[PDB]
Amino acid sequence: VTVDGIEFPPTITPPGSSKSLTLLGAGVRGVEIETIQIKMTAIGVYAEPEVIASHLQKWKGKSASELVEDDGFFKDLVQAPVEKLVKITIIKGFKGSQYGGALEESIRDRLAALDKYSEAEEESLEELREFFQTKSLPKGSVIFFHWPSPSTLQISVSTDGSLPEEAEATVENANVAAALLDVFLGENSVSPSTKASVAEGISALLM
């Protein structure tokens, strides 16, 4: 599986962890320049395989397009109590401040939508922003967002694209952790293409 020349392996064991996760799908974060689509990042979604399929039986038989059209499907995916991983490969370079700043806005927007941007979430999110501000994210850099459970989140970064031995940072706040997963798989996702690919992967896995 490749996205803009970037290979996504069929399985990944997250940094510092023991359980192997399987590729559900991959897409891109695109932006527009005068209607021209520009790829900024490649995004791959991984989860416990036979396991998550056991939380998605109601979707068996549905085509990828049928799943794309049901927000309840992605809600099920987001809420499923299994390990998940998002692997990001940077295509166009970001300063750490830029990537963290963009990510902060998407998360703040989601938390506001839920009326959950209180002091605890604001402080947790600021720690996540500051984490990225200390990083540089040139082309080829990778980010691993690992949710061992829906309420927890571990982050690691690698400039050269290699798999870190261990996770570097943790988001302890459950609402911030959930909101970040929504950046990728929520209704207001930064990557409809990733969602479409995940729907295709899950449709195939179920049948």
- What CATH number is given to the structural domain containing 117? 3.50.70.10
The answer to whether residues 117 and 154 belong to one domain is yes
Structure resolution, Å: 1.6
How many of the other CB atoms lie within 10 Å of CB of 65? 11
The answer to whether residues 159 and 87 belong to one domain is yes
What determination technique applies here?
X-ray
The answer to whether residues 93 and 40 belong to one domain is yes
What whole-number distance in Å separates Cα of residue 123 and Cα of residue 118?
A: 9
The residue type at 45: V
The answer to whether residues 21 and 113 belong to one domain is yes
The answer to whether residues 85 and 26 belong to one domain is yes
- Contact present, 132 and 96 (Cβ < 8 Å): yes
The answer to whether residues 128 and 202 belong to one domain is no
The answer to whether residues 44 and 57 belong to one domain is no
The answer to whether residues 35 and 105 belong to one domain is yes
Domain hosting residue 67, numbered range: 51-79+185-207
Q: What 3-state class would DSSP assign to 122?
A: helix
Closest listed residue to residue 48, CA positions, set 12, 15, 79, 84: 84
The answer to whether residues 191 and 180 belong to one domain is no
Q: Which residues are CB-neighbours of 177 under 8 A, at least 6 positions away?
A: 147, 150, 151, 152, 153, 171
The answer to whether residues 174 and 73 belong to one domain is no
Q: What 3-state class would DSSP assign to 21?
A: strand
The answer to whether residues 201 and 156 belong to one domain is no
What whole-number distance in Å separates Cα of residue 74 and Cα of residue 45?
A: 12
The answer to whether residues 142 and 115 belong to one domain is yes
* Number of domains, the chain: 2
CATH number assigned to the domain comprising residue 55:
1.10.890.20
